[PDB]
Amino acid sequence: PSDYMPEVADDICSLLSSGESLLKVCKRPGMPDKSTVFRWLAKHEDFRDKYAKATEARADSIFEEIFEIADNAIPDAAEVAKARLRVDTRKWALARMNPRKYGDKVTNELVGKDGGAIQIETSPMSTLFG
Amino acid sequence: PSDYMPEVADDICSLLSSGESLLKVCKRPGMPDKSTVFRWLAKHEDFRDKYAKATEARADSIFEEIFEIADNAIPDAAEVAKARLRVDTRKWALARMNPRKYGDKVTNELVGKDGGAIQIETS
Amino acid sequence: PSDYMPEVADDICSLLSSGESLLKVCKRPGMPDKSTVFRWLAKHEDFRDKYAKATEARADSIFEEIFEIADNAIPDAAEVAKARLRVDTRKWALARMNPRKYGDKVTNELVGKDGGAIQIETSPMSTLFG
Amino acid sequence: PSDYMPEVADDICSLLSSGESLLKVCKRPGMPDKSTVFRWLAKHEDFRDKYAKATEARADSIFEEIFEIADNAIPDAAEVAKARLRVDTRKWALARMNPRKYGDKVTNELVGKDGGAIQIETS
Amino acid sequence: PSDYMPEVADDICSLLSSGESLLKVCKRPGMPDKSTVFRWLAKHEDFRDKYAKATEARADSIFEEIFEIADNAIPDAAEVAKARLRVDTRKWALARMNPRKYGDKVTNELVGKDGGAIQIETS
Amino acid sequence: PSDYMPEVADDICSLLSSGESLLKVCKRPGMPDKSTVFRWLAKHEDFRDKYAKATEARADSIFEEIFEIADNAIPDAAEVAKARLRVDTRKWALARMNPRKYGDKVTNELVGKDGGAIQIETSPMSTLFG
Amino acid sequence: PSDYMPEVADDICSLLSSGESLLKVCKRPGMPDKSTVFRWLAKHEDFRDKYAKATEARADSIFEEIFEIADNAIPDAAEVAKARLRVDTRKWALARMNPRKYGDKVTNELVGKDGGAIQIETSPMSTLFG
Amino acid sequence: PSDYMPEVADDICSLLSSGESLLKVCKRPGMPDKSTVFRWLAKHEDFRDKYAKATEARADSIFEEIFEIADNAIPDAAEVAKARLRVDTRKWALARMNPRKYGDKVTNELVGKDGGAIQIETS
């Protein structure tokens, strides 16, 4: 397909939601190529909105998938290395697909000199930096 | 089973809470598939919340799993690499399941130039 | 056991305090399974409090253990890799068991442009972000 | 072709937008070489901007590429190492092509000593 | 020996101070086991403090150990990996034993957009 | 050449702009050695300015090059390791050649205790740190 | 030696200044063991002061040494791994011996939402955190 | 040669400036040993400064060296590992020789909860 076809776009959203990657989806019978999908996205806000929803769902699906990829890895050096690459790629992508949920989490205990208060000295500007 | 069912959802939460993963909970007979569970979650805030707490319980179980996976790894190169991948995947996931509890922990001692006070100029 | 049994809970706390992991404890004669332990925790504040104390002690015990795991590792590739995994897992866990004591430690010397003062310019809000 | 041409430049943007890299776009017959494209960019702000947006489109294509490179890696030691290098190079590049979208994501919970309020003294 | 003893505790501190680990101190005849030492520490603030300072002394000894472990590693793959693990474990531990001395050290030059002043808007 | 020669300096800038490294450039017929190039830079502002422009262009050229080095790596352990070293070296250098463009990119969502507001307590100075 | 001996302490400072590690120094003819050195340090401020100076010099010496360890490594897998360990250990230690000089160096360009100004909203305290 | 000599020191700076390391400069006949150079530096501020600038020049030379070391690595496992160590050591050193130029570069987009404004409460 080249022309925008909502039924096809809807199927793409459903498959992505389940965790399937776009390039893999686009290899299925009757699907548009990825370039065409991105063109559809660019010109159709209805699709963009549903695709954004599908991306959130895709991330939640992948989050479960990474446990399976690790736990079921064939215990052969090259196969484990591949499983690691697949998991690392998904971890990286999840943080971008939903930063609030899957971004890194750090608690910073902020203290000052010698574990006392943070010491701050303010002074008049000494150069023209405005 | 596609239509939201408050009893099946409560059941899912109980299973997750006892350490079971979503994939296993859904592979059971009569259970909704993963896509359906996620849809339920999306369209019901009450399920979203109990599921969130079940997720924190799941995390506490996974935390104890990582010790076993590491300590009981088969001492063969690929099996140890696999165990490492299993543990690393769980560590990463734990931080997201309960950030307060399992996120990274850093203490930053903030000082200024040469260990003096932090120097600020404002316009 | 399924019913809450304080004497058993107390033994669990003592074993954890010495550095033993929960799943290993739960394999000992007469112990509840881990699911049951977590259920006991959920419903009994007396146990939760003692378990929190035991977790602090567990961390201090593990902190000593990591030296032994490294120093006594069998000098075989796979055994050293396993020892490393065991130590890395403990290091990660210790920071969560007692963040104040075992979290990362960084001293940040904060300076500004060209090693001078930190330059800050404040301006009226330019969008509605309140 | 050395002299700036508004149509060839628009063409380059369209090709980059469809996922094609600059090296490939320039290896085509009748196209400017890379050095010439960069010169054009330097001396025309209108091209700089459309090129920037084409770069963001390229990034969205590359994002989907990394899944394929990882999942379809040949399970041989060197081929997996190569796939890892290909993916790592793309991840790094993506952050620079669209920082808002593909940069690192961190949530920092900022607290003070012992989990109390952050303590500050000022002069 | 289970009951707190101020002389045995002072002894433990002296031994730790001279570089000896707790495991070794406790494996000695007549010494309390590790669990008992930790209990003492928990229920006596005076011991907690002298133990903390003995821990800083221990850290200074360990700091010099890492040079020896690295420089004198047997040049065999697994022995070097073991030496690396021994050193990495000590580096990590040192930061926690004396954060001021052995924690990470970073100098952050903080600037604003394009190297200008840091731009802040407040409500 | 030892004496500053603008035509040669100009050629150096052109080659660097295309992504070639300085030491490689200095091996070409008729080029000065690197020490001499740095001496020319030190004493000639016209060259320094053009060299700075060339460095920006060099970085943009290298940014494209890293894809090719990775994608075309010979699938042999040592050759892939070399390709990785070549790419990692370029990534590191690019951030220094143009920090604004090629530096690391992080979005920090800043929150306070328990995900609420950041809690700040100010107090009079308690030591002489001015 | 057990008793504090300034001439010996002075020699220790000179050897450390040249980059030699303490345990290696203490193996030389007539030197005290490390425990004794630390005892001398604890009780003699003259030695502590000179030892601190020696530590600064030691760091500058090691900074040059790391180039030699890397560049002269025997090109054998295990020997390169050992050289790497020796260099990594020194890099880590240098930052602690002289944090101002050998600590990590980062320039953070701080911007706000969408690359605009950093947006800050202040509010009355909503809990008792003073 | 132990006594500070202003001409030998200027010479050292010139050599370092041309890319030569201190070890090589000192292994030359008639030159002070490393310990003596460091002593000079300690007791003369004028030498400390010219040496600092010579160090920045040295850094600019080393920056170009890393490209050659990487690109010309012998494609053998241990030789590539050695080249990597040589490059990594230089990268680390460069940041300390000229922090402004060769330190790490990060752009931090600072936002508040949920991408809103950063929320602060003060006492």
Tab-separated table of N, CA, C and O in Angstrom, chain A residues 64, chain B residues 9-26 28 37 41 47 50-62 97, chain C residues 34:
chain	number	residue	atom	x	y	z
A	64	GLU	N	7.985	-6.705	29.842
A	64	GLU	CA	7.797	-8.093	30.242
A	64	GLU	C	8.700	-9.010	29.420
A	64	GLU	O	9.265	-9.967	29.945
B	9	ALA	N	-9.153	-9.591	37.629
B	9	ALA	CA	-8.142	-8.554	37.820
B	9	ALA	C	-7.568	-8.636	39.222
B	9	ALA	O	-6.356	-8.565	39.409
B	10	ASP	N	-8.443	-8.776	40.213
B	10	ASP	CA	-7.988	-8.938	41.587
B	10	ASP	C	-7.125	-10.190	41.691
B	10	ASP	O	-6.151	-10.228	42.444
B	11	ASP	N	-7.482	-11.207	40.916
B	11	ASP	CA	-6.746	-12.463	40.903
B	11	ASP	C	-5.347	-12.241	40.345
B	11	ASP	O	-4.366	-12.752	40.880
B	12	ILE	N	-5.266	-11.474	39.263
B	12	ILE	CA	-3.990	-11.193	38.617
B	12	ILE	C	-3.072	-10.497	39.603
B	12	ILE	O	-1.912	-10.868	39.739
B	13	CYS	N	-3.603	-9.499	40.302
B	13	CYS	CA	-2.839	-8.765	41.302
B	13	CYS	C	-2.313	-9.670	42.403
B	13	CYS	O	-1.191	-9.500	42.877
B	14	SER	N	-3.131	-10.626	42.823
B	14	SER	CA	-2.731	-11.529	43.887
B	14	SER	C	-1.579	-12.407	43.420
B	14	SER	O	-0.659	-12.694	44.183
B	15	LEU	N	-1.633	-12.823	42.160
B	15	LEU	CA	-0.624	-13.718	41.608
B	15	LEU	C	0.686	-12.978	41.415
B	15	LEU	O	1.746	-13.476	41.785
B	16	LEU	N	0.607	-11.781	40.846
B	16	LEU	CA	1.782	-10.938	40.690
B	16	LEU	C	2.384	-10.670	42.064
B	16	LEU	O	3.601	-10.700	42.236
B	17	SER	N	1.518	-10.426	43.046
B	17	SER	CA	1.958	-10.112	44.399
B	17	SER	C	2.751	-11.258	45.009
B	17	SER	O	3.653	-11.037	45.820
B	18	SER	N	2.418	-12.482	44.616
B	18	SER	CA	3.083	-13.657	45.167
B	18	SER	C	4.356	-13.987	44.388
B	18	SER	O	4.987	-15.015	44.623
B	19	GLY	N	4.720	-13.113	43.454
B	19	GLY	CA	5.970	-13.247	42.728
B	19	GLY	C	5.827	-13.703	41.286
B	19	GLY	O	6.798	-13.684	40.535
B	20	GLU	N	4.627	-14.118	40.894
B	20	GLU	CA	4.412	-14.620	39.542
B	20	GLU	C	4.483	-13.468	38.542
B	20	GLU	O	4.027	-12.363	38.830
B	21	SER	N	5.065	-13.719	37.373
B	21	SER	CA	5.165	-12.688	36.340
B	21	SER	C	3.855	-12.602	35.563
B	21	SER	O	3.003	-13.489	35.671
B	22	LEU	N	3.698	-11.549	34.764
B	22	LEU	CA	2.471	-11.360	33.996
B	22	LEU	C	2.343	-12.413	32.909
B	22	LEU	O	1.255	-12.921	32.660
B	23	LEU	N	3.456	-12.728	32.253
B	23	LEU	CA	3.461	-13.741	31.202
B	23	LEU	C	2.913	-15.073	31.709
B	23	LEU	O	2.131	-15.728	31.022
B	24	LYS	N	3.325	-15.475	32.909
B	24	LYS	CA	2.870	-16.734	33.483
B	24	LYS	C	1.405	-16.643	33.877
B	24	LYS	O	0.637	-17.579	33.659
B	25	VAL	N	1.020	-15.516	34.468
B	25	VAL	CA	-0.364	-15.329	34.896
B	25	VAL	C	-1.303	-15.443	33.703
B	25	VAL	O	-2.407	-15.967	33.826
B	26	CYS	N	-0.855	-14.958	32.549
B	26	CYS	CA	-1.702	-14.904	31.361
B	26	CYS	C	-1.685	-16.207	30.567
B	26	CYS	O	-2.616	-16.491	29.815
B	28	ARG	N	-2.023	-18.947	31.852
B	28	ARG	CA	-2.948	-19.829	32.550
B	28	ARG	C	-4.285	-19.886	31.826
B	28	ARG	O	-4.695	-18.911	31.196
B	37	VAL	N	-5.001	-7.452	29.395
B	37	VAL	CA	-4.676	-6.960	30.726
B	37	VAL	C	-4.261	-5.494	30.640
B	37	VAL	O	-4.701	-4.675	31.439
B	41	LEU	N	-6.042	-2.220	32.355
B	41	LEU	CA	-5.258	-1.247	33.103
B	41	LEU	C	-5.486	0.163	32.566
B	41	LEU	O	-5.694	1.100	33.331
B	47	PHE	N	-7.902	-0.680	38.903
B	47	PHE	CA	-7.054	-1.819	38.572
B	47	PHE	C	-5.613	-1.354	38.414
B	47	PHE	O	-4.681	-2.047	38.818
B	50	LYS	N	-4.103	-1.143	42.150
B	50	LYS	CA	-3.862	-2.436	42.783
B	50	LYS	C	-2.772	-3.201	42.033
B	50	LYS	O	-2.008	-3.964	42.624
B	51	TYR	N	-2.700	-2.977	40.727
B	51	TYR	CA	-1.679	-3.601	39.900
B	51	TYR	C	-0.329	-2.988	40.222
B	51	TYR	O	0.675	-3.688	40.271
B	52	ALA	N	-0.309	-1.680	40.457
B	52	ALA	CA	0.925	-0.994	40.827
B	52	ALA	C	1.477	-1.524	42.147
B	52	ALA	O	2.685	-1.702	42.293
B	53	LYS	N	0.596	-1.783	43.108
B	53	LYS	CA	1.034	-2.279	44.407
B	53	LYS	C	1.451	-3.738	44.296
B	53	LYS	O	2.386	-4.169	44.968
B	54	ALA	N	0.762	-4.495	43.446
B	54	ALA	CA	1.137	-5.879	43.200
B	54	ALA	C	2.513	-5.912	42.541
B	54	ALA	O	3.293	-6.836	42.759
B	55	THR	N	2.804	-4.884	41.751
B	55	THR	CA	4.093	-4.762	41.086
B	55	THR	C	5.192	-4.498	42.113
B	55	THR	O	6.295	-5.015	41.998
B	56	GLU	N	4.897	-3.696	43.123
B	56	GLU	CA	5.873	-3.472	44.182
B	56	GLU	C	6.116	-4.763	44.973
B	56	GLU	O	7.249	-5.051	45.340
B	57	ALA	N	5.076	-5.556	45.211
B	57	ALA	CA	5.257	-6.839	45.883
B	57	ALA	C	6.102	-7.785	45.038
B	57	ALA	O	6.985	-8.460	45.554
B	58	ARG	N	5.820	-7.823	43.739
B	58	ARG	CA	6.585	-8.638	42.801
B	58	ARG	C	8.056	-8.255	42.882
B	58	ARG	O	8.925	-9.121	42.931
B	59	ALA	N	8.326	-6.953	42.922
B	59	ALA	CA	9.692	-6.451	43.014
B	59	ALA	C	10.407	-6.981	44.263
B	59	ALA	O	11.591	-7.320	44.222
B	60	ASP	N	9.702	-7.044	45.386
B	60	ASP	CA	10.340	-7.511	46.608
B	60	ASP	C	10.738	-8.982	46.470
B	60	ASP	O	11.753	-9.402	47.026
B	61	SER	N	9.950	-9.752	45.721
B	61	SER	CA	10.264	-11.160	45.459
B	61	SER	C	11.470	-11.276	44.540
B	61	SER	O	12.383	-12.059	44.798
B	62	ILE	N	11.473	-10.484	43.473
B	62	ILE	CA	12.573	-10.476	42.515
B	62	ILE	C	13.892	-10.081	43.183
B	62	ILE	O	14.945	-10.615	42.847
B	97	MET	N	10.189	-0.750	38.907
B	97	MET	CA	9.017	-1.270	39.600
B	97	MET	C	8.788	-0.558	40.937
B	97	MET	O	7.648	-0.354	41.354
C	34	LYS	N	9.001	-18.549	50.686
C	34	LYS	CA	9.194	-17.109	50.641
C	34	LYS	C	7.864	-16.374	50.521
C	34	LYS	O	7.684	-15.321	51.123
